[PDB]
Write a protein that binds this ligand. Structure first.
Ligand SMILES: O=C(O)[C@H]1O[C@@H](Oc2cc3oc(-c4ccccc4)cc(=O)c3c(O)c2O)[C@H](O)[C@@H](O)[C@@H]1O
Ligand SMILES: O=C(O)[C@H]1O[C@@H](Oc2cc3oc(-c4ccccc4)cc(=O)c3c(O)c2O)[C@H](O)[C@@H](O)[C@@H]1O
Ligand SMILES: [Ca+2]
Ligand SMILES: [Ca+2]
Ligand SMILES: [Cl-]
Ligand SMILES: [Cl-]
Ligand SMILES: [Zn+2]
Ligand SMILES: [Zn+2]
Ligand SMILES: [Zn+2]
Ligand SMILES: [Zn+2]
Lengths: 524, 524
C-alpha cells in the first residue's frame, strides 16, 4: 500500500498568534493554544517522520483579528508560505475585500496553488484572473501524484463581497467533470478540498464519483474519534465515513477552526488509487508543543504595526457612546444601536430585484457590550477603545430563525428583568415593546420588523411562521446567555466578520457618528 | 463737495447665471434677471458716467448653485476679478469648505482685498493666513482715499465650517479701534463693509464712532425708497438712516440677495470727510439691461463642466427613494427621511461640552418633494436626479422657534388632511403622532423631540415655552404653504446651504444609502 498523510487546517480566521482556549486573546501564555509558530513546530515534526505528506488549507484564512484588518491578506501569504502549504481552497471570507483584495495580495503572492472549481468570471475580470486560482492541481508526492480539486460555498455572494462578475456554481455539478478529467489523465488519487460546510462535504463524498477523500471547512466542524482532548464536542467520528453512490467508503474530515487543531489523516491506497484504510484525529495545538522560535520572532516583528494601528484614530463620535451595563442591560442604549447598525451595514450584499438587502435585522445581548466610549478625547475612537467594548474576539454571524423563535428570544431578553443580566437585547431593524407587568414569557406586546422583500424598507408585525435572517453574535448563535432556543431552532448559521472589525469599518466609513436612543425598545 | 458712488452686492450666493424672478433657474430668458454678465453691463455703464466709483461685495458669494459645488470658489475669484470689484467682506458662507476652501481658491486668487476685522487665528494657521484677509484697506479714489473696514458675523461657527482655530470677535469691539486707527492715519472717509445682518449693521452705524456708511448683508435685506420695482417688499427706506451716538446721520444699505439688484448709493462728503447727503436705490437687473456678450460667452464655457458633472454618479441607493406625492403628502416617506437626515448632517458644527450638536431637528413640507428616484439604474443617483426632487433652488435654513410655534406647525401639517396638499411635514429628530378623528388644530397627540443639550441623544416631549433650533426650507421660513406662524413667530433665521447640494453631499459621503420608513410619523 501507498500511505499518504494529509495535514489540514480550515477557518483559521486570522489566528496568527496563539490564543486562549476559546480562541480569543491569549492572556495566560503557559495555557495558550494554536498560532502559526506552534503549527510550524508540529508540521515540521510530522514531516520528519512521514514520507508522503500534504499540508492543505480548506479556506477562510481571511478575516478574524487585527492582523487581517491591517495586513489584508499579506500576512496569510507570508505565513502560509513559511509553513510551505501544498494547496489551499478559496473560502467565503477570501472575498471580504472584493476580488481585488484576493488577487492582491493572496493570489499573486502565494507560492502554492489556490483552488476552486465552481467559481467562474466574466467580462474583463475573466482575463484578469485567469490562472490565478485553478479548478485543481496535480501534485507530486513521493513517486506518485495526487489530484486536489477545490470548491467554494455557492452561498458566498450572501456571505462576503465577491462582486457581480463572479458566479458560484453548484459544487457537485462543477466538481464532477473535473474529477472525470483527472481520471482520463491517469490521476487515480483525488482529494476534494473545499469550503462549503460539513453537510455539503458529505453530499460531495456521496455523489462526486472518484473523490477519495473530502477535506472541508466553513462550518467549524469538530470531528473526533475517542475522548476529546479539549472543550469542543464532536459532531461525529474522525474521519466521518460516507458510503458513496459508487459503493466506496469515503472519509470526510474537518478540523474545527481558529488554528486550535491540526487535522491529521492517514490514508492507505492500493495501486489503483482505491482507499484501503483511513484513520486519524485532529491534534490539539496546546502548550506542550513549543512555538517555533523563528516563526515567533517574525510574528513579533509583524506585531509592531498592529500595536501602532490600535491607537490610531479610526473616526470621531460627537456623542457619548453609552455602553454602560446600567443602560445596555436595562433599556435601549446608543452603543447598542451603533453596533447593530454597523452589523447591518457589514451585511449589505448585492441584491437582485427581490429585496433591497437580504438582511435587515440585528440582535445583540447587552452582556456583550463591555464598556462605554467617552467623546471628550477630541471625539477620537481607536481600535483599543473598541476592544474594550467588544473584548471577546467574537464574530457577528448570520442566522435564519422562525419568527416564533425570535419571539421566544425577546421573551427570554426580559424574563427576569431587573437584575442586570446579560440577556437583554439591543436591536437593529426591530421595534419591540414590552409590558413588564405581564407574566414572564408573555411580556412582548409588540414586535415589528423591517422588511427585506420590499423596495422601501418599512416595519411590519413579526409573523410567527416566517423565517427571518438575523445578524447576531456567535455567542448567541451558540446558545449563550440562556438563548437555547436560538441554538436549538435556527435553520441556517454562517459565521461572520470579527466583531471589532465590523464596528471599526462602519466608524471609518461614517467618519463622524452620533447614534441616538430612538425608541427601538419601549416599555408600556 | 466730493461725491462718491458706492455700488454694492451681497449674498449673491452662486447666482453666476441669470435667474428667474424668484432667483431660481432661468426658464423664460426674455424675463430673466441678474447674473454676472448683466451686472457687468450695468457696472460698466455707471463707471463711464461717474468719476468716483467703488464696487463692493458684503460677502456670501459662496454657496447656492451647482457652480459652487463644482468650482468651489474659483468661479467667484474669476468672475469678481472680471467685474473688477474693489473690495469684498468675508461672509459666513465663505467658510463652508473650511479655512482651506477659502484660502484656495478665493484668498489666493482675488485681485482685490478681502476684509474682516473681527476674525483672528491662532496656532500654525495664524502664520498661514496672515495678510490674506485684512481688517481694512485704504483705497485711492480719484484724488482722495477711502478706508473700508470689514466685519463678519460672530455667529459664523454656527452657520458654516470655519474650524476651531479661528475666533469671531464681537463686531463693534473689533471695529472701533481699526476705525480710530484710520483716523490717526488721516483717512476721514470710512465705509464699514460686512456680513452680520441688517440689525447688527444698524448697531454698527449707531455705535462705531467714525463710520460714515455701513454696507451690509447676510439677512438678504431689501431696502427701497419709493415704489418697489419687483416682488420684494422693502424692510425700510434706502438708505436706512441711523442717528449715531456722536450725533451724525449714518446711511445703512443692503441689496437683497442672489444678484437680482445692484445697490447704488451716492454720498456727498465735505473736505473733513463728513457725509453731507446720501441718496440712492438698488437697481433691478432685469432683461432691459443686456448681458455683456464676453462675460456671457465665458459663463457658457464654464457651464460645460457643470453639465458634465450633473450626470455623474454621486452615490448609490439600494432602496427606492419614494418622493411620490401619494406618500410624502399623506405619511412618512423615505425620501423625506433622507432629506431631513441630510439636513441635520449638513448642520453638524463644532460643539463645546454643552451639546452634542447645536441642532437636532428638521421639518420639510411634502410639497417640497417633487419626484421619487428609482434605484433600478444600477442604484445610481446623479445631481440631475436630485434636481427633479428639489427643483426650486431653495436653501435649508436654520431657525429658532418656540415649541408652541412648532406645535402650531404640526397642527397646520394635518389641518385639512386628505386632500394631497403640500403642507404635510416630513421630519428628522422629531417623532409625532396624530389623531385625525380630533378637531383640526387639536390633532397632535404626541410630539417628541431629540435633545441637543445632552451627551446621549434621546427623545423627550416638546415643551411649549422652550426655543428649538430647527432646519427647514427657506420656503417655510418665509411662510409658504400656509405656515404663517413660522414666519410670524420665529426668533432667529439664518439662510443655509442649497437644497440639492445638502442632499448631494450627504449621498456622496454615505456612498450607499438605504433610508427606511421607521415611525417618525404615526397615526392613532
Ligand atoms: O461577566 C459578567 O459581568 C456578565 O457575564 C455575562 O456573560 C457573558 C459571557 C460572555 O462570554 C463570551 C466569551 C467569554 C470568554 C471567551 C470567549 C467568549 C462572549 C460574550 O459575548 C459573553 C457575553 O456576551 C455575556 O453576557 C452574564 O450574562 C452576566 O450575568 C454577567 O454579569
Ligand atoms: O404645485 C403643486 O402641485 C403643489 O404646490 C404646492 O406649493 C408649493 C410651492 C412651492 O414653490 C416654491 C418656489 C416656487 C417658485 C419659485 C421658487 C420657489 C418652493 C417650494 O418648496 C414650494 C413647495 O414646497 C410647495 O408645496 C401646494 O402646497 C400644493 O397644494 C400644490 O398641489
Ligand atoms: Ca481513487
Ligand atoms: Ca468721516
Ligand atoms: Cl454544514
Ligand atoms: Cl438681521
Ligand atoms: Zn470560516
Ligand atoms: Zn466560511
Ligand atoms: Zn447669505
Ligand atoms: Zn450670510
Amino acid at each position: 500500500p501507498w500511505e499518504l498523510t494529509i495535514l489540514h487546517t480550515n477557518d483559521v480566521h486570522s489566528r496568527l498568534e496563539q490564543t486562549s482556549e476559546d480562541s480569543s486573546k491569549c492572556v495566560d501564555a503557559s495555557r495558550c493554544m494554536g498560532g502559526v509558530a506552534r503549527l510550524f513546530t508540529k508540521v515540521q515534526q510530522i514531516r520528519r517522520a512521514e514520507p508522503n505528506v500534504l499540508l492543505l488549507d480548506a479556506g477562510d484564512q481571511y478575516q478574524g483579528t487585527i492582523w487581517f484588518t491591517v495586513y489584508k491578506g499579506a500576512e496569510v501569504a507570508h505565513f502560509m508560505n513559511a509553513l510551505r502549504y501544498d494547496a489551499m481552497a478559496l473560502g467565503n471570507h477570501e472575498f471580504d475585500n472584493g476580488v481585488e483584495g484576493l488577487i492582491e495580495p493572496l493570489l499573486k503572492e502565494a507560492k502554492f496553488p489556490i483552488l476552486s472549481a465552481n467559481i467562474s468570471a466574466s467580462g474583463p475580470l475573466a482575463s484578469q484572473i485567469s490562472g490565478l486560482y485553478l479548478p485543481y492541481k496535480v501534485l507530486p508526492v513521493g513517486d506518485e501524484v495526487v489530484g486536489i480539486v477545490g470548491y467554494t460555498s455557492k452561498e458566498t455572494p450572501f456571505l462576503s463581497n465577491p462582486g457581480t462578475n463572479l458566479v458560484f456554481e453548484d459544487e457537485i455539478t462543477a466538481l464532477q467533470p473535473e474529477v472525470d478529467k483527472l481520471k482520463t489523465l491517469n490521476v487515480n488519487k483525488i482529494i476534494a478540498l473545499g469550503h462549503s460546510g460539513f453537510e455539503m462535504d458529505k453530499l460531495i463524498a456521496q455523489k462526486v464519483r472518484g473523490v477519495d477523500v473530502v477535506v472541508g471547512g466553513h462550518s467549524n466542524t469538530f470531528l473526533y474519534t475517542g475522548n476529546p482532548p479539549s472543550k469542543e464536542v464532536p459532531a461525529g467520528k474522525y474521519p466521518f465515513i460516507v458510503t458513496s453512490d459508487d459503493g466506496r467508503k469515503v472519509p470526510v474530515v474537518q478540523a474545527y477552526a481558529f488554528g486550535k487543531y491540526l487535522g491529521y489523516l492517514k490514508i492507505e491506497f492500493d495501486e489503483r488509487g482505491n482507499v484501503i484504510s483511513s484513520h486519524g484525529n485532529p491534534i490539539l495545538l496546546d502548550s506542550s508543543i513549543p512555538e517555533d522560535p523563528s516563526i515567533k520572532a517574525d510574528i513579533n516583528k509583524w506585531r509592531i504595526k498592529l500595536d501602532d494601528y490600535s491607537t490610531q484614530e479610526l473616526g470621531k463620535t460627537i456623542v457619548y457612546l453609552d455602553g454602560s451595563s446600567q443602560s445596555c442591560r436595562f433599556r435601549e442604549c446608543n452603543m447598542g444601536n451603533l453596533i447593530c447598525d454597523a452589523m447591518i451595514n457589514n451585511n449589505l450584499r448585492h441584491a437582485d430585484e427581490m429585496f433591497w438587502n437580504h438582511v435587515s435585522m440585528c440582535i445583540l445581548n447587552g452582556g456583550g457590550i463591555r464598556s462605554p466610549i467617552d467623546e471628550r478625547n477630541d471625539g477620537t475612537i481607536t481600535w483599543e477603545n473598541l476592544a474594550a467594548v467588544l473584548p471577546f474576539g467574537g464574530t457577528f454571524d448570520l442566522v435564519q430563525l422562525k419568527g416564533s423563535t425570535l419571539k421566544k428570544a425577546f421573551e427570554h431578553s426580559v424574563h427576569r428583568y431587573g437584575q442586570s443580566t446579560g440577556e437583554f437585547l439591543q436591536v437593529g431593524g426591530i421595534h419591540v415593546v414590552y409590558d413588564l407587568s405581564r407574566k414572564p414569557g408573555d411580556r412582548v406586546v409588540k414586535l415589528d420588523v423591517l422588511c427585506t422583500s420590499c423596495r422601501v424598507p418599512s416595519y411590519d408585525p413579526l409573523k410567527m411562521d416566517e423565517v427571518y435572517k438575523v445578524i447576531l453574535p456567535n455567542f448567541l448563535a451558540n446558545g449563550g446567555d440562556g438563548f437555547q432556543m436560538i441554538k436549538d431552532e435556527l435553520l441556517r448559521h454562517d459565521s461572520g466578520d470579527q466583531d471589532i472589525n465590523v464596528v471599526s469599518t462602519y466608524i471609518s466609513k461614517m467618519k463622524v457618528i452620533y447614534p441616538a436612543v430612538e425608541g427601538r425598545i419601549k416599555f408600556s
